[PDB]
Amino acid sequence: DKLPYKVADIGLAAWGRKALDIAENEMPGLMRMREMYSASKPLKGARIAGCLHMTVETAVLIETLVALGAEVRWSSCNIFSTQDHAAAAIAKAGIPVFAWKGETDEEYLWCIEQTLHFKDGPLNMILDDGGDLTNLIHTKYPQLLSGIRGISEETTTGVHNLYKMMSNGILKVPAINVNDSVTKSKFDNLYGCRESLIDGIKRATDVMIAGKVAVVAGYGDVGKGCAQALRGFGARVIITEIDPINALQAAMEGYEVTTMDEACKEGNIFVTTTGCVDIILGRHFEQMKDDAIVCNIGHFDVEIDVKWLNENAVEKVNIKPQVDRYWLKNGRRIILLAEGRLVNLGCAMGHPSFVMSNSFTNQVMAQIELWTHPDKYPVGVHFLPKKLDEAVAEAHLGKLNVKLTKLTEKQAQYLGMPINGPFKPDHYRY
Amino acid sequence: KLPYKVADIGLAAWGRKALDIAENEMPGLMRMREMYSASKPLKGARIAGCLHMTVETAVLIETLVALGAEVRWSSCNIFSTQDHAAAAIAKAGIPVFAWKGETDEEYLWCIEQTLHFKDGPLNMILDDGGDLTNLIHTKYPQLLSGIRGISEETTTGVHNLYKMMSNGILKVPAINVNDSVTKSKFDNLYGCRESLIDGIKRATDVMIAGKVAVVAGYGDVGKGCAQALRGFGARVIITEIDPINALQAAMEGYEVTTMDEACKEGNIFVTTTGCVDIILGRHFEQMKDDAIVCNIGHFDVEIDVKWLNENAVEKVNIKPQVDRYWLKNGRRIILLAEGRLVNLGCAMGHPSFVMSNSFTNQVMAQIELWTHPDKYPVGVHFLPKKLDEAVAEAHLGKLNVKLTKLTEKQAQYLGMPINGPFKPDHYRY
Amino acid sequence: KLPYKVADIGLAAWGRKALDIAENEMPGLMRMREMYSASKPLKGARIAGCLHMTVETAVLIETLVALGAEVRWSSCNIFSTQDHAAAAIAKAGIPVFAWKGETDEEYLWCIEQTLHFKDGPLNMILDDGGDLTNLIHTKYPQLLSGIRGISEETTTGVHNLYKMMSNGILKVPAINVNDSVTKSKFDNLYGCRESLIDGIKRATDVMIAGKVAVVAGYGDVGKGCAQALRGFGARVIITEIDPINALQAAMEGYEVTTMDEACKEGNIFVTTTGCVDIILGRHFEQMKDDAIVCNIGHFDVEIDVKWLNENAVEKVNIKPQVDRYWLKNGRRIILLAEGRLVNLGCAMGHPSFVMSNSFTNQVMAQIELWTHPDKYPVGVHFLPKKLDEAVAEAHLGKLNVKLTKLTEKQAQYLGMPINGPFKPDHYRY
Amino acid sequence: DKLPYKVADIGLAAWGRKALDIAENEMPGLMRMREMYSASKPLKGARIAGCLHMTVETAVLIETLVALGAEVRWSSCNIFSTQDHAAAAIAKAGIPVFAWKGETDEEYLWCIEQTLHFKDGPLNMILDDGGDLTNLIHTKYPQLLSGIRGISEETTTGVHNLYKMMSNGILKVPAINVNDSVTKSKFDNLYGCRESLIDGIKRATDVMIAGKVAVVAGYGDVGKGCAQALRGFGARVIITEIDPINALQAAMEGYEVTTMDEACKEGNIFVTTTGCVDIILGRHFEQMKDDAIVCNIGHFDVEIDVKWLNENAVEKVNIKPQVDRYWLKNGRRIILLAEGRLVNLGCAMGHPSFVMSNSFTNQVMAQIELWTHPDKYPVGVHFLPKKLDEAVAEAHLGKLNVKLTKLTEKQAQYLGMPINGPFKPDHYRY
């Protein structure tokens, strides 16, 4: 007596399928997983609850998991990130999906709850992005924990939470940290944001980047890509940081590194990338240039104090969906994107398919590892082996017409490594 | 007769909000309003405009009206109208005939609606690409003697004016706005550096990083396009006919080769030449699977779209202005905006700040021609450097740029007028 | 009289090896030799040259001689001579009066040695910065009627020629070589992009990454300098008097402010203005400890070196052309090349490939003035675009650039001559 | 009856001292070690044999070790890298140093042998760059191993050798891998090469970079910096790689990735960064463009087959020290820099002082850790703790006028980290 799916408009499915066809041809990693494993069906018996942005890219991931034998039920991990034509295509394919663009907070929680119960029993695998599904099970459904073989987690904030859960004795299910595969963190977080930040800002505002001062809070993988994107279009980028190593990197790349207390007086565009609370506050907003654009690409909605704007502005003018222009008591305006929620996914289409093929090939590999080799994965947080990490990269080289060199026997002996790798030590930072 | 013709007048409120935001990004145009709204230098002008009907152009239109002109408007491209901007203009009582997705015949009908005002025929032309200019000269020559001047926005349009003049067929004075320094070195370069990728992304959501991109032409537009693609991690290959532009591209680290070679390597193709026959059937047949092909230069003639329509074995419309073709060789080609300007057809054109440079020049040109016509005999003219410098200066405050002033000692040393102009007429910036 | 005067003729063999390497990087000059060595268009010319006596200039000198000229040479800067290049020229029998580290009086003596040949006084000038031009006009006016033409290398020199002409005091026709497209947009820009950092590094070995660098001026030289510093991870701040150049710098992501503000922040200061009084005592007094200060523009007047010498409390010579001053405030300033051109004074100037563009223009200018003087009345002239394009084309093969040729259909469409020139005279590239 | 030092010309000492004074003011990390530890003298009793490029930067390191109480004896680890004025200043200061620019291979070995015996006994600490000192002791002087408390090793190839020695049971002394401190590998190897490669090429050849094709073999930290430097000056850079992850990084940065077998036909400049043998061979040289410039910035002299040039060229013309122009049987010329040895140190001045202050502050810290806390360091290869790594970066922020943000108590609680760090997990790649 439960809904089979819930999406904005299943009639968008034909357009969705065209977008999926294009994406498949950009995602050789996922297509190789299908070629290699569609017959052997390694995920047979798996019942995967997924909580991850319901985008065209994610649809390709979902169909890969199903091709490999899994049953899947899906929700988005963000109220604005669903692409309704992708959700429609997945629903039309008979896969239970509960996701649409513009969910309320109540609807969001309800959608996750729809993914827990399958025909043959409760979920036995978690594929998570940000840990909401992980946390829901541990907090509200502890009786389901014993039946879950593994968790794979997509993003930096999610994995931070898993390590904290483990250190405090709260984690009860083995997890693979997908974020920190080399082929995820050094590609998705960096090159993905380098394209999708600007895409979000532009679709929302059509603002010129050239000539502006842009303030980027944080200089981790996300901040590095955001800063590079903005600099490339001729913004002058100012960085804030708490970590002296990341701060020194930023200075050595030619960026001014200062505090938000100083930078708020100069920025025309503000991007938060920190995964931390209380980055942009009332005292900052009051000092900003007129029509400063403020957005978050890090986590949830707490980097920016959106509550302060709602409480203190004279008026909030909605410009269009996910774009609000606040008029402050000082007579100046602030343009806030996506209510302070992820701007690339909320105001544009998130990362492009090619780089998401890296991240999602790691996801499929992690699901196969946890489902088929559980003995290798005790309760705790684990990485994929370097050999598989390398294999993700190798699967994407052909599409780019990259010609990789093979070591000669003489060179392999000289270096003391195998011809087929792995080629780097475990601590290598790339 | 119709007061206007637009897609949906109900879009006017949203249009107005977008115009409000754009005004705050366009200090040059707002300064023209501050300076000239009382004195109304364009009183008596009846300006027919043919220029992409975007949010940015709406700000220009309302500036012309604030300065006392009567205006009637059409777009210069069948896909470039932003319907909310058109609706806001219509709602404000200004005759505009423009919508996204015109037929070719509707396009001409729209230009024709701009020619006659209550008080008489048009007496000024504001053009982008020469269609209004050519229409009057070829079909309505009886209207020419009543037109005081033409201002022309874009490289292809000004090329046509110079050709008309050399052939003795130009009959109205024109100002070349494209070749103001503050237009050509800003709009054509930095505008395309942002809006090319915006068009490609909204249309395809393709990853740029890791791709080979082939840019045909390395003029102002090609320079901006190449820099954009390289910034996102594409490997950019350039084609050129001019050895100077070619050497520039080589000295910036780009491979410069022919399209006959580059067609085998590119994943993304962008034409920027203003020339016919850049991408042909023999090129399409060699392209990598799902190569994305688009034009940012002129009209629809850089890419042989006719060839694709006639020779593909499948053609699937993905969404408006995005078509995916399957060739006999089994490979696919993705064509944007039917080969028409991709930045305006698949996205929103250049952002407002840089359009404020171009459009401040347009307002200055209209004022010069309308109020000082004897300074402009039949022929093609530039705005004075002093005015060109003034356009730039008007945008410095928004960016918090602090300009240095020469001391009297330094001005004497340089033999330079202390308030400019600061460069000789041949200076290339 | 002396056959030459150089530091050490024993350096000639090493000089010749360096010239051999440079010739293979200078296809424009080598092409001039291939085309004109038999016909000897410069037969009868007696060229006095005043231009940095470097390896690159040695290739130019031997090209002029190959084309039939007699030549006598001096450097235009007291620190820019490369002694091995000077020795190779001297060994080849060419009168050259140049060494690194001349006194100001020796500098003038060297120019004076170039004026008289066996067959009579000079009849052509090849100048860089106007010193030879000014010397003749002011001290040897009786020689003017015997001089057929002047070609001038650099922005400051051509500025002086235009001033002379407007004041009615220029008495010999001149060609402005600086403002060939293939000179100004290449040498001034890409040359400085490499040779500024070479000068700073050889002098100081300072890390660029992490520093704030202040570049005064954003013309061709300032653009090249700023890009170089940014590429290595310096944060670059720009000063400018021209609102157009200022807006360019802002649109490229640089902070544009005054020297009065920037002096408090910079670790490296580079002057590129061609103007007096850019860095003054009030600036030095505010600078970060061990700020490195240098000039790449003109003469020694951009930086107030007199102020440092008079006001520092300590001055220590680190090595040739590097001085470290201690100010009364206890902080240190490092001054390069006594405020003279840092790229030529502390390193080797621009690399040979880009100098081949500049120097091919110089050879073309000398040929034009010597063989077609009636085309050049007294005044300041440009080389024709056709020749400018030819300079670029002559360098494409070395870089393996493949230039596209228009089809006859395309040339008709564009109304363009199929072999060029391809751009109108106002084109800015 | 042994020499007290051996240098090119001790009369260069006054110029050397001026260069050292300038460098000190660029090296706040080393100067902070002096401020903090010159009175307590933590290295008292240490007798450190050092084998590391005898440059101005290294002189500042040497004087720091002596200020901290160590006795030191020094040699260079490269026959061309010594800066004779720096060596003179160290000799004049009474420190035994055996180093000059342009040593023969025999003289090189002799110089290392001079650093082993002190007045009060044999060395009891090793500071090494490339492992020659480490290998000499293990192979020729095993009886000295028991008296050595620790090894600190500077460079990637050196540390590779230490791990191999450990895996084969040959390492008998505890070692700290300095190369893989974050503040070394991500700064020295990357930003150092980004400046010093071009400096070497320019001083040797004065070649224009703009317009050229440059081929960079390897895209690790060194290759990344070299490629960026060359691209910045307008070369078109082609990368070769054996590792699919590094290769994908290069492609995503806009470089063509192909094999040397293809790239040798196109390159005008060749830079080897691999640490591997047999990168540029006869079959490559024969296909190169006329006057191709060929150089190595990786390891020793075996990346480039210099022996092939010597055996097969028609003639070798010496242009000036460390620059040779070979005329081949095909009539074309090859310009080889520094006989295939490190081009940045051999043809220029190596990395600038500021970034060497990061590397050498790690060296001082490693010497203090091994000398004063030996119980923490069993036989094996170890990293410096992240807290010290962060402290190296923090010590350089003031010179750059960087303003680092401090977490609030609320933020530190939210993130679950200490206000004073460390701020990243052990696996973080920066």
Ligand SMILES: NC(=O)c1ccc[n+]([C@@H]2O[C@H](COP(=O)([O-])OP(=O)(O)OC[C@H]3O[C@@H](n4cnc5c(N)ncnc54)[C@H](O)[C@@H]3O)[C@@H](O)[C@H]2O)c1
């Ligand atoms: N929107 C997306 O598509 C996307 C993609 C990847 C990751 N993410 C999210 O982005 C965020 C950042 O991810 P990351 O991988 O870059 O993590 P990271 O740990 O590499 O970088 C975060 C940086 O923020 C800095 N920081 C923390 N608090 C700060 C403060 N108060 N002020 C200034 N700097 C501060 C840290 O020192 C760190 O260097 C995470 O929330 C992650 O889940 C989003």
Ligand SMILES: NC(=O)c1ccc[n+]([C@@H]2O[C@H](COP(=O)([O-])OP(=O)(O)OC[C@H]3O[C@@H](n4cnc5c(N)ncnc54)[C@H](O)[C@@H]3O)[C@@H](O)[C@H]2O)c1
């Ligand atoms: N979409 C836009 O927003 C936008 C903006 C500005 C200009 N434009 C248009 O873009 C086009 C280019 O303008 P521009 O200012 O760069 O002009 P330009 O003259 O500076 O550059 C065009 C270049 O194309 C080269 N070229 C010509 N034919 C060629 C061919 N067959 N193959 C390779 N190269 C060839 C020329 O040598 C020239 O360097 C024009 O049509 C102009 O109207 C469009």
Ligand SMILES: NC(=O)c1ccc[n+]([C@@H]2O[C@H](COP(=O)([O-])OP(=O)(O)OC[C@H]3O[C@@H](n4cnc5c(N)ncnc54)[C@H](O)[C@@H]3O)[C@@H](O)[C@H]2O)c1
């Ligand atoms: N060292 C070299 O190898 C080399 C090479 C080429 C040119 N030059 C010399 O470099 C200088 C600059 O040449 P260019 O071609 O760039 O000329 P330019 O005219 O293009 O640029 C100089 C810029 O300085 C700006 N300026 C003038 N006075 C200023 C001041 N007080 N403060 C800030 N900005 C100011 C001007 O607005 C102008 O934009 C000239 O002296 C020229 O002869 C040297």
Ligand SMILES: NC(=O)c1ccc[n+]([C@@H]2O[C@H](COP(=O)([O-])OP(=O)(O)OC[C@H]3O[C@@H](n4cnc5c(N)ncnc54)[C@H](O)[C@@H]3O)[C@@H](O)[C@H]2O)c1
């Ligand atoms: N000259 C200097 O100042 C300097 C500075 C730092 C490091 N180094 C040295 O530079 C070298 C590289 O150091 P790194 O830190 O970049 O190491 P790295 O391991 O990060 O990079 C080396 C790269 O070379 C690649 N490689 C190996 N064999 C190859 C082959 N046959 N063809 C193509 N690519 C190949 C590897 O895949 C790797 O990515 C080492 O020898 C190191 O000791 C020199």
Ligand SMILES: NC(=O)c1ncn([C@@H]2O[C@H](CO)[C@@H](O)[C@H]2O)n1
């Ligand atoms: N197009 C997409 O589906 C997309 N774009 C970005 N992300 C993921 O969103 C996560 C943040 O929630 C990041 O870790 C990315 O991997 N997914």
Ligand SMILES: NC(=O)c1ncn([C@@H]2O[C@H](CO)[C@@H](O)[C@H]2O)n1
């Ligand atoms: N946003 C806009 O209205 C816009 N964007 C680009 N262009 C103009 O379109 C012309 C090409 O028709 C160029 O010359 C630009 O000036 N207009």
Ligand SMILES: NC(=O)c1ncn([C@@H]2O[C@H](CO)[C@@H](O)[C@H]2O)n1
């Ligand atoms: N290597 C060289 O001989 C060299 N380098 C730079 N310049 C010239 O020096 C002039 C400044 O005097 C500039 O216009 C350059 O053309 N010459």
Ligand SMILES: NC(=O)c1ncn([C@@H]2O[C@H](CO)[C@@H](O)[C@H]2O)n1
């Ligand atoms: N200026 C210098 O002393 C210098 N420059 C580079 N390197 C070191 O040289 C090692 C290679 O032998 C690298 O790991 C660098 O840390 N030292």
